[PDB]
């Protein structure tokens, strides 16, 4: 099972050195062809190589950013490091650990990779989000199937992840793509079921903030006169 | 070093058909025998994975409506039946020299048969009324095309600031497209007024789509 596990400091100040950690399991940094490295992409945005390092102990390099990487690695526990000095806010992104195979052919791919670990370059301070729930206008003449929200606002930095009824509740679902206003993140996601299946069962918005490590649950219930 | 020009940057092609996207390379790419020349699919919230190595060489795996060809500069993906799950952003890169570059990715979009927005309006959260704010939030799902304008009135008269939108990326199943408009006032402004309204214009109607509720009433 090849796994590529990607962890960061979440958020830094500028100028400062960002060290990132990939741990990797499935496969050997002994065997020969393989590498393991670093690719990293801006927030909507495409792809930049930034390093890979090889069973060899041979390490490419992309080279406008040469100066400033270091990448190592710890064979005996799985795990290559990557560091870039003077850090600024162009480094804002999600980077990616990615599997290198060397080719039969020559040549490289990247044939596995993490799961990302999003990286903010930022003085902007740390904040944890309200998570609202919204259920629908009292008294609506209800239809054949009924929405029901989560509100998620006031936080920072990217990234919040955010379920329904703990992943279990899976279709039907629309979260919304994070927006940035004033140095606060604001999320929603939508859910939409049968009027049979609300309120008669429970659903419960998910919400967890890993840089202020917060884990909110938030039951929809129908509005009162409160 | 080698830069990669990817076109075009933006395809919507129906269901079963042809989608066909291009990679020029700045300079050769290829030997006698091999293209240095790769493909990868990322999905919407996903790592970018592995289809094509090798300009031809399918990963093993993957469906085989995913073709690859082309040499020297110019290569070529196709996608052929596109199917729904296809909607993302494919990119590709060189294996020729360091720096290893990527080209700037071309999106990949089904087009499908027009559908109107599912309107949904949300009073602020009596839990968020209790700490001062007030958020009214508009969902306008599962539509097609992704164009959409929302329009808020308070009490009549058209409210454009404190507004903030999101567009969810073409769904995977549906292939339609769904937004979030939220409404973000002070609990006292909110106080102050009686109706509030989202109006969702369309391309699928000439009358926009409205829900309205009025503060403080069942």
């Known amino acids: 099972e090849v796994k590529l596990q990607e962890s960061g400091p979440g958020k830094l100040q500028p100028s400062q050195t960002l060290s990132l950690t990939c741990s990797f399991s499935g496969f050997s940094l002994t065997t020969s062809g393989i590498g393991v490295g670093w690719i990293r992409q801006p927030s909507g945005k495409g792809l930049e190589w930034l390093a890979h390092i090889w069973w060899s102990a041979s390490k490419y390099y992309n080279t406008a950013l040469k100066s400033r990487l270091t990448i190592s690695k710890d064979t005996s526990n799985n795990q290559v490091f990557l560091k870039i000095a003077s850090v600024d806010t162009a480094d804002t992104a999600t980077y990616y650990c990615?599997?290198?195979?060397?080719?039969?052919?020559?040549?490289?791919?990247?044939?596995?990779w993490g799961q990302g670990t999003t990286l903010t370059v930022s003085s902007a301070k740390t904040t944890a989000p309200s998570v609202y729930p919204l259920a629908p206008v009292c008294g609506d003449t209800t239809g054949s199937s009924v929405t029901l929200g989560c509100l998620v606002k006031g936080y920072f930095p990217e990234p919040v992840t955010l379920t329904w009824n703990s992943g279990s509740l899976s279709s039907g679902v629309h979260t919304f793509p994070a927006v940035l206003q004033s140095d606060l993140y604001t999320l929603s996601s939508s859910v939409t079921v049968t009027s049979s299946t609300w309120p008669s069962q429970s659903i419960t918005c998910n919400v967890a903030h890993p840089a202020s490590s917060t884990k909110v649950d938030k039951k929809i219930e129908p509005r009162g006169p409160t | 070093d080698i830069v990669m020009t990817q076109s075009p940057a933006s395809l919507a092609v129906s269901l079963g058909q042809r989608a066909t996207i291009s990679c020029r390379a700045s300079?050769?790419?290829?030997?006698?025998?091999?293209?240095?020349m790769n493909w990868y699919q990322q999905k919407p919230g996903q790592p970018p994975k592995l289809l094509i190595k090798?300009?031809?060489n399918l990963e093993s795996g993957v469906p085989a409506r995913f073709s690859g060809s082309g040499s020297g500069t110019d290569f070529t993906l196709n996608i052929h039946p596109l199917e729904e799950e296809d909607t993302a952003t494919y990119y590709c890169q060189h294996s020729w020299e360091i720096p290893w570059t990527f080209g700037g990715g071309t999106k990949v979009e089904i087009k499908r048969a027009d559908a109107a927005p599912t309107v949904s309006i949300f009073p602020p959260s009596s839990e968020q009324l209790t700490s001062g704010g007030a958020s009214v939030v508009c969902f306008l799902n599962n539509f097609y095309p992704k164009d959409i304008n929302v329009k808020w009135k308070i009490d009549g008269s058209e409210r454009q600031n404190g507004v903030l939108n999101s567009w969810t990326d073409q769904d995977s199943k549906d292939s339609t497209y769904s937004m979030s408009s939220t409404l973000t006032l002070t609990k006292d402004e909110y106080e102050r007024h009686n109706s509030y309204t989202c109006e969702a214009t369309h391309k699928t109607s000439t009358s926009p789509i409205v829900k309205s509720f009025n503060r403080n009433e069942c």
């Open positions: 300079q050769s790419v290829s030997t006698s025998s091999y293209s240095y």
């Open positions: 990615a599997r290198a195979y060397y080719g039969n052919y020559g040549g490289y791919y990247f044939d596995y």
């Open positions: 090798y300009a031809s």
